[PDB]
Design a protein around this nucleic acid. Structure first.
Lengths: 291, 21, 317
RNA sequence: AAAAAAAAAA
RNA sequence: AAAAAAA
């Protein structure tokens, strides 16, 4: 009884990855979502070429991509995902042809193509959300060299253009800067570096992150923040008996001398509490506590 | 005319102006 | 006796410049490297015109260059470099024709042309390294007007596109800004503004800069840093007996172990530029030290917090 | 009760 | 080390 959005992603992952797709591992789901996003953006080998206004170097790149042999059944994507023979059929039938626009399909009145385009859009949105969460998870232990000043960190995450197009309100990168550093329309979404994105294992099943659900510290920190946010957010997690790298969520931050006195708000089971800021980046705090 | 900048190097921290420090 | 790059650079400079090429003068080697870089980039008079995607202004400039007479034999290069009558032969022989690409020559299968293309690439790399070192050496006692803020100084040196193409890791400038701002792939190299470059009188010989070599203060400082770096690097030098002008190298700094110490604003908190300096308001950032690898061992030297250009002139008064 | 949907979409 | 490749 899941929403069509997550049902589409589940069916697509099943069709493209057979039984090798594990529905409980964050890395596996993130890699599968990345591959599906690439497939639905016409960026794999053997797919159509983006030659509307491409430059000569871009022209050669697209032509080589189109001419290059497409992925074959049995390919290894990531670490534990294996492509099946049905992936070609899905890529042919469910990926809209390059340059397809929703307006044209809607005007044509074809119900099948309209439904296919809606499923494609939902899959793009879900894959972009998973991509953003994985970027936040990666940033906890390995920062990007580009982040050397507060202005540079203001635009995290640094994702591709199509990622921004699908989910403007979560993706940063160059395109977010261009949108902000330029003419703004009414349909303008403001970047939220700390939007709560449930972990992929919870995202693809419709589960909403809340208090009392078992998660890992890195999982929660990537869900509610990223590497360079303050370390006080680590107070939202509490390790379980025996640790074992698995604990439980006890709260979720709100609004997602004196300077160090600033406090964050944590929504606990009883009620909102004010927690003093630590002043140390989550990346630095995790590095220090690693040993 | 002159400048007092000291760029970050060899793990040091950048300085916008030597005198102000 | 020498690697291919150093041997080819020596051969090129000797052939082009006759006996006038002094092998023990940094300025002479810098001038010769600049001239060879101009030659191999077709930026001299009378060479091919770059018109592939040139704008009408660029087309006119290149056409005027082509129509202009090429330099005549015996012309004075810089101060103490004079062209020989046999430089035209080398320019016509060892300079790849405009638009030459390695893949095309590899498809051709001619070993001689492959060797010539590899020689051209190596010569470009060596000349660009020498150009970068001379840029720093100039910056030691002659500030660049284009630099007025830390952001501008972050991309030093400012060199042409060919220099960035040959040695991306050592050359700054507009193309370095363009590469850094855009997507950073696996082939991207971060601009190492203070990467160690042996002086030209060492680079062509291949003698790696190390402790004990007799060098002048300015040339050593250019090798390890540039004009706007900290003055503490002067501690890497020590005058020899009798003062004079040539001393000795006593240490070589290290530029590793660098991490981020920022905390962006979130959930109502306020951004912090640095966690360490925050403390309780104590903005005393003078305890930082630079690691110097000496013969006895590694030591740490407290930063002085003053520009090298300032210190060099001040201590000379 | 900002969160989710449908219109638009280097 | 090697292999790609202009404001």
């Amino acid at each position: 009884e899941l929403p069509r959005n997550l049902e589409v992603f589940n069916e697509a992952c099943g069709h493209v990855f057979g039984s090798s797709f594990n529905r409980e591992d964050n890395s596996v789901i993130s890699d599968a979502a990345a591959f599906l996003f690439k497939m639905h953006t016409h960026s794999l080998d053997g797919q159509e070429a983006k030659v509307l206004r491409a430059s000569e170097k871009k022209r050669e790149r697209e032509n080589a991509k189109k001419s290059r042999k497409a992925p074959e059944a049995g390919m290894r994507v990531g670490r534990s995902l294996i492509l099946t023979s049905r992936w070609t059929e899905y890529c042919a039938t469910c990926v809209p042809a390059l340059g397809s626009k929703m307006k044209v399909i809607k005007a044509s009145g074809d119900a099948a193509m309209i439904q296919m385009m809606k499923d494609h859009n939902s899959l793009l949105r879900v894959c972009v959300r998973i991509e953003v969460w994985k970027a936040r998870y990666v940033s906890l232990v390995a920062l990007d060299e580009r982040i050397q000043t507060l202005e540079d960190a203001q635009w995290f995450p640094y994702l591709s253009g199509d990622s921004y197009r699908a989910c403007p309100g979560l993706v940063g990168g160059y395109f977010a800067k261009k949108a902000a550093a330029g003419e703004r329309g009414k349909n303008y979404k403001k970047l939220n570096q700390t939007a709560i994105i449930p972990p992929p294992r919870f995202l693809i099943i419709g589960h909403r992150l809340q208090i009392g659900d078992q998660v890992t510290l890195r999982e929660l920190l990537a869900s509610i923040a990223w590497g360079l946010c303050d370390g006080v957010l680590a107070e939202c997690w509490s390790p379980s008996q025996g640790d074992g790298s698995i604990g439980v969520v006890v709260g979720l931050p709100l609004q997602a001398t004196n300077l160090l006195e600033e406090c964050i708000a944590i929504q606990k089971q009883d009620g909102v509490i004010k927690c003093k800021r630590s002043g140390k980046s989550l990346y630095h705090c995790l590095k220090e506590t690693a040993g | 005319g002159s400048c007092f900048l000291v760029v970050a190097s060899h793990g040091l921290s950048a300085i916008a102006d030597s005198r102000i420090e």
